[PDB]
Amino acid sequence: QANLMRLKSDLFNRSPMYPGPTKDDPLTVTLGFTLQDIVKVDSSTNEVDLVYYEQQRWKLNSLMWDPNEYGNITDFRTSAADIWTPDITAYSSTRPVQVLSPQIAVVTHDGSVMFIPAQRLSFMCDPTGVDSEEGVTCAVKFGSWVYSGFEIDLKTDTDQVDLSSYYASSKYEILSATQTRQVQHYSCCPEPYIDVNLVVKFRER
Amino acid sequence: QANLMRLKSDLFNRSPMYPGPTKDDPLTVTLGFTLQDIVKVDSSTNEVDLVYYEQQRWKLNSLMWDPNEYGNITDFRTSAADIWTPDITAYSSTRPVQVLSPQIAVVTHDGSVMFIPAQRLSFMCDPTGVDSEEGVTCAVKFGSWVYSGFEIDLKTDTDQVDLSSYYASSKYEILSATQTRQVQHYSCCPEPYIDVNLVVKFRER
Amino acid sequence: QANLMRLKSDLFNRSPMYPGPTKDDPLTVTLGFTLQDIVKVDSSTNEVDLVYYEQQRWKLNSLMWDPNEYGNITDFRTSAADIWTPDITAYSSTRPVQVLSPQIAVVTHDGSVMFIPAQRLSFMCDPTGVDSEEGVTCAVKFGSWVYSGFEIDLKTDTDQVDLSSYYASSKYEILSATQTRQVQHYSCCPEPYIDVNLVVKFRER
Amino acid sequence: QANLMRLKSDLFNRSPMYPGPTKDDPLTVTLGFTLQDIVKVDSSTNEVDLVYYEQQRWKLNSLMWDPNEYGNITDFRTSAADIWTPDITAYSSTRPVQVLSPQIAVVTHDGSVMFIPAQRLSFMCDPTGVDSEEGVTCAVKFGSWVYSGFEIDLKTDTDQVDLSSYYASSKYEILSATQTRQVQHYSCCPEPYIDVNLVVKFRER
Amino acid sequence: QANLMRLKSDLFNRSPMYPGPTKDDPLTVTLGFTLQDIVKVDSSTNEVDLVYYEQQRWKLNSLMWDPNEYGNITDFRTSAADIWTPDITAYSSTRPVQVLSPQIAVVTHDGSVMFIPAQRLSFMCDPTGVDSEEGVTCAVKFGSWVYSGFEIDLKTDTDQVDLSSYYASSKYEILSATQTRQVQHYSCCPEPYIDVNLVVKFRER
Ligand SMILES: Cc1cc(C)nc(/C(N)=N/c2nc(-c3ccccn3)cc3ccccc23)n1
Ligand SMILES: Cc1cc(C)nc(/C(N)=N/c2nc(-c3ccccn3)cc3ccccc23)n1
Ligand SMILES: Cc1cc(C)nc(/C(N)=N/c2nc(-c3ccccn3)cc3ccccc23)n1
Ligand SMILES: Cc1cc(C)nc(/C(N)=N/c2nc(-c3ccccn3)cc3ccccc23)n1
Ligand SMILES: Cc1cc(C)nc(/C(N)=N/c2nc(-c3ccccn3)cc3ccccc23)n1
Ligand SMILES: Cc1cc(C)nc(/C(N)=N/c2nc(-c3ccccn3)cc3ccccc23)n1
């Protein structure tokens, strides 16, 4: 592990702190959602609770290295606190997000970072009609809180939310779940605003 | 990039910690509220829960720089923990405020700082009459906890609360929402006390 | 702010940490309560919830300075963590106190410190009779947890609790609210124990 | 306070961190309980909530000093975070313990330390029969989580569980309370395992 | 105590931070569960709460020492924060795990580390049939969040969950409780993925 210690030392100790993206050096964050369970619906406050994992991927030149210079190390694990991470936020939460997984990322020699936090989110949704056959739809937008599209571009690898881990005995079954990039401009202002819309149609099982 | 790292280093590492405003060097904080949702009303304890964003703006000379000296950088993002922030507080909360957004601010070359925390607040309100057509009104004052008007002056850019992001399917519809600066004096003391009164009239949809 | 930075540097960096009061160097803390709201009563667990602010005042010689030596600065604000604060505690709480205000204190050139934390407290009270006209009384003692009267003396500026901010549309109306210093001596021990008894008589409005 | 500052500096800054007790240098921790209130009983989950103070005493040679060398100071108060504390744990809690008091300890020149945290504990208890005259008994064991009796010896000081502060208007009255040391040996192993059993018989008042 | 201070200084201060396991230097973590109580079942959200201890064991060469070089010290206790710990996570939790015990580990001269955190976990389980004689089964998988089987190998010392500490008066009795290692290979990828499946069959007592 001499090499791994050296690599991490070189990237984090013997280097200045990365100050985040800018208009001159933008970055693309790829988002994907894996939905585990709709745990709870509150029809008296219009709040729905969702447990899901949020795959985040991005690439920084300042996290690149040549494996040949570090004993053929091609990737490593590190605390998410040791590196810059994007400020992706649910735009319609009603409680602080609860983190269900360790805050550790994987960094690869090409400078890519993968970070998959598991979370429980309460967000605004009217569940009226959930008890019917057609079910009910709601949506929650995710995006940067402080960075516009000039600094952080969002995208997805697919529009289909991963349902392969959805709890088989959930009180609610997922009829449909998509994740879609949206770009909006406003007339006042030059900068685009980008978000990913997670739209889920579900009903009582 | 190199310039942004140098700029931040110069402003935060190679400079002393700003000790807050004083009577000799006062500052103006501009507040605006964007109301997302009246989530919940408890008629048995007279508490209402509100999700909103609070736009805060102010300007410090010690955060000024000349863009020409730093590769034409006109603004940057930084953790709210790295800079001084005003102690704006709801005066009639009944629980600690829950923060729903990343604590990151934007700092501009003229020394202006923008910080828009999303929050959920429980505050004192009697919701009696909410189920009627005329609805119900309540109010909450915001202001500095420890600074008088000689140190921190508050103001608003408008008296109208921004309702453009209010949840369309909330259990409650906003009939009216204003934000107004008030100045008060006490007999003992020469210094004015300033707050912003957020007043919201709402009812069941 | 050059002077304020120098003053704070001189008082906190270029000085040893104040180790708290002792029998040889005692101190007096003045307490006053402002009661905002009796938020909740639980008659099935005998717990009452109170929102209030607790004004605390004391004076330390080691926080004195001459204004003429520091650009006529007569006072400043500082984080409550930077200074010693007294360990005043409710003696009959049933949950951790929730802090509703920034932890910032005001220090004046004579060495006086003001600190006014807003708090929500759950404490032991049997609310039986609250629904009647005569109402119900209960009480909670506040005092130091670790210091006797030889080290920390408590007092009040008045026996009347400040009710001027009591929520007009609270579910409960305050018939009476007092704050009284009490001394107790024990046979074993020479040192007195001091507390302030907050007594509140209230009923359903 | 020059001497107190020097004493604390000498004991904590100019000294290495105490690494905890060992078989060669064992430690006795005395425990005593003061029961304030049985706040709540949940007969649907078999959980009972208790508010109490837990007096903890022990002695470290590395906290000794000669009063003559420090202006006749015989004791002082300090944050519990500044000193080693024993890992005494309730063995049958169902929630994290809630601390209701300041975390401050008293250290005396002979190296003794007193620490009396106030706590609310949820622990496993079947309250069936609590509504009858005979009441119900349950118990909670306290002991070190990682130290055997070769490193930490537990004991109790007073005869009795202190009921002198028990809330007079609690929903539950204490019929009886004991605290007793228990020592267990296993065939495999030479080292004894020690706990203190708090046993409380109570009923509805 | 001189030796223990020296040993700890040598292992933690005068040694580089262990960067975690890799494919070249893998690690085996042994897991065992002790189940204390099924505290709660929510049939309306399909969540079950478990209080249990999770015994974790592993071995690092960089924590080895020769007892003869350190006054025959064969083991010591240290804060879990001072050492690397594995990122073992419940894969179907619905809330953050609550820690019920001190975060302290035991390190032995052969470089083995024992860490037994007590925890309360909420996880996904349909309790339908719990009130019948046959009872109900559910399961939760534990494993590394970021490490594959090439870096962290999991195993158990026994398939039987330790029920010797199960609360005798729990609302639920355990009919059966097992812990089993499972290996999954995927077609895309050479690396195995490993978890331990805790399966519990229980019913109302
Ligand atoms: C739910 C959500 C989430 C996020 C990240 N932003 C906004 C928002 N309204 N943003 C803004 N809203 C406005 C705005 C909104 C209404 C009227 C005028 N301006 C202006 C802005 C200018 C710069 C940056 C953002 C805004 N809303
Ligand atoms: C230079 C800059 C940078 C950033 C990150 N935001 C804003 C801005 N105005 N933001 C917002 N502005 C407003 C806004 C602005 C004017 C009037 C009403 N609302 C609302 C928002 C709501 C959510 C998030 C942001 C805003 N401006
Ligand atoms: C909820 C809130 C928030 C803030 C920032 N201040 C106050 C307040 N009462 N301030 C004062 N209140 C009083 C006061 C209040 C009641 C009765 C008599 N005096 C006197 C003051 C004198 C000088 C400065 C302030 C006060 N209250
Ligand atoms: C919430 C809040 C915030 C702040 C900053 N001050 C106060 C306050 N009461 N201040 C004072 N309050 C009183 C006061 C308050 C109640 C009754 C009598 N006097 C007197 C004062 C005298 C000099 C300076 C301040 C006060 N309250
Ligand atoms: C969910 C979401 C996320 C983000 C990042 N922005 C917005 C938004 N409405 N933004 C803005 N919204 C408005 C707006 C929205 C409604 C009516 C009038 N103006 C104006 C803006 C002007 C400048 C910048 C942003 C806005 N909404
Ligand atoms: C609710 C409360 C709050 C505080 C601050 N102290 C005490 C208390 N009992 N203190 C003491 N209680 C006793 C005590 C209590 C019961 C029986 C015998 N002794 C002895 C003490 C000796 C020195 C200092 C304190 C005590 N109780």
Ligand SMILES: Cc1cc(C)nc(/C(N)=N/c2nc(-c3ccccn3)cc3ccccc23)n1
């Ligand atoms: C030298 C010294 C200094 C201080 C600050 N306290 C005590 C002490 N015994 N305190 C307490 N002692 C007891 C106590 C002591 C003996 C038997 C039963 N209870 C209870 C307490 C409850 C709350 C606070 C303190 C105590 N002793």
Ligand SMILES: Cc1cc(C)nc(/C(N)=N/c2nc(-c3ccccn3)cc3ccccc23)n1
């Ligand atoms: C509630 C509680 C609290 C504490 C501090 N320890 C234990 C415990 N079971 N400990 C042990 N339990 C066992 C054990 C338990 C069941 C079956 C076989 N072995 C072995 C041990 C070996 C060394 C040290 C401890 C144990 N239980």
Ligand SMILES: Cc1cc(C)nc(/C(N)=N/c2nc(-c3ccccn3)cc3ccccc23)n1
């Ligand atoms: C050298 C050492 C030091 C310490 C502190 N514990 C243990 C140990 N085996 N502990 C335990 N071992 C077991 C255990 C061991 C074997 C089989 C089943 N259970 C259970 C425990 C439960 C609670 C606490 C400890 C244990 N060993």
Ligand SMILES: Cc1cc(C)nc(/C(N)=N/c2nc(-c3ccccn3)cc3ccccc23)n1
């Ligand atoms: C609310 C409160 C606050 C404080 C500071 N002390 C006490 C208390 N009971 N103290 C004591 N109570 C007793 C006590 C109480 C009942 C029976 C016998 N002794 C003895 C003490 C001896 C020394 C110091 C204190 C006590 N109670």
Ligand SMILES: Cc1cc(C)nc(/C(N)=N/c2nc(-c3ccccn3)cc3ccccc23)n1
């Ligand atoms: C509950 C849980 C816990 C953990 C630790 N991982 C996963 C998971 N799905 N992992 C992965 N899932 C996929 C995956 C899942 C669905 C469809 C396609 N790919 C790919 C992966 C590639 C590398 C590493 C992990 C995965 N799920």
Ligand SMILES: Cc1cc(C)nc(/C(N)=N/c2nc(-c3ccccn3)cc3ccccc23)n1
């Ligand atoms: C190099 C590396 C390291 C680690 C720790 N994870 C992954 C990974 N792909 N993970 C996952 N990958 C996917 C995934 C990957 C590709 C396509 C679809 N899904 C889904 C996941 C769901 C839950 C947890 C993890 C994943 N990759």
Ligand SMILES: Cc1cc(C)nc(/C(N)=N/c2nc(-c3ccccn3)cc3ccccc23)n1
């Ligand atoms: C409540 C409690 C508290 C403590 C501190 N230890 C234990 C315990 N069972 N310890 C052990 N328990 C067992 C055990 C317990 C039940 C059945 C079989 N073996 C074996 C052990 C072997 C070595 C060391 C400890 C144990 N239990």
Ligand SMILES: Cc1cc(C)nc(/C(N)=N/c2nc(-c3ccccn3)cc3ccccc23)n1
């Ligand atoms: C519960 C759990 C735990 C862990 C550690 N992994 C996985 C998982 N599905 N992993 C993967 N799942 C898939 C997957 C799963 C469903 C459908 C298609 N692909 C693909 C993967 C490819 C590479 C690595 C992992 C996966 N699931």
